Amino acid sequence: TTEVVMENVTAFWEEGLGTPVLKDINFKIERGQLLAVAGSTGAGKTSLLMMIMGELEPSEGKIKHSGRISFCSQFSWIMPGTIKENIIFGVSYDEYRYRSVIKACQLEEDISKFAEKDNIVLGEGGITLSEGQQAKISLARAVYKDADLYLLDSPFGYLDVLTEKEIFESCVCKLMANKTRILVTSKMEHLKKADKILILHEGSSYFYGTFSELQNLQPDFSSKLMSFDQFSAERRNSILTETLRRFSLEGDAP
């Protein structure tokens, strides 16, 4: 596994009056630790992860890690073929690794709904899963793939999936306990159980540290966000956006 180091990092989006997508980003994450990244819509959570992978070039500062990454996108995707083929996806088959992954990702119930189990063909002529089941497969695919560093721009966080709590506890927390990983998340339980948390807004880091430090350093912010996890993904992201937007020389009425 690996360590991730960011030091005074600034980047601009090359493709496609506000300029940099990410500004003065500073964090270290120890081997086997979890970073929870939370923040407003368009803060730059996906782009931070892009930058770690090499998809985005920094104009300032250093990025350090081993360079063996598995990335999960926030958009569920499915290749034509079996559920099993979608999780394995060109990677060497191991029955114990696969089983523990599909268990952690809460797919065992879904799979057993089918007569062919995980050998059911998904696609054009086959069957179509719910966006929720497709999210579980997508995370499983990214987690089954072996890596030093796991960038989870989780599809949950923009979905309301009944069994997400179980995914986070079993997969991200326990199955992946010895992996260095980064979870983009809109849930407060995830921030509480993380080793480190990062709050991003308009390209900037408005907080980096632990949940304890957050609760202590910014209590008014904390009390506004920490039953919050019972709200829908769309609603939680709104409240977060609304709250983060107060960090300015105005801050509107509602």
Ligand SMILES: Nc1ncnc2c1ncn2[C@@H]1O[C@H](COP(=O)(O)OP(=O)(O)OP(=O)(O)O)[C@@H](O)[C@H]1O
């Ligand atoms: N490949 C790209 N090329 C150019 N601009 C991009 C690219 N990806 C993202 N951006 C821009 O950078 C800004 C921040 O994007 P990003 O997707 O990182 O936000 P985010 O925090 O992931 O938001 P959300 O929570 O809605 O996913 C956005 O305004 C977006 O238009």
Ligand SMILES: [Mg+2]
């Ligand atoms: Mg994103």
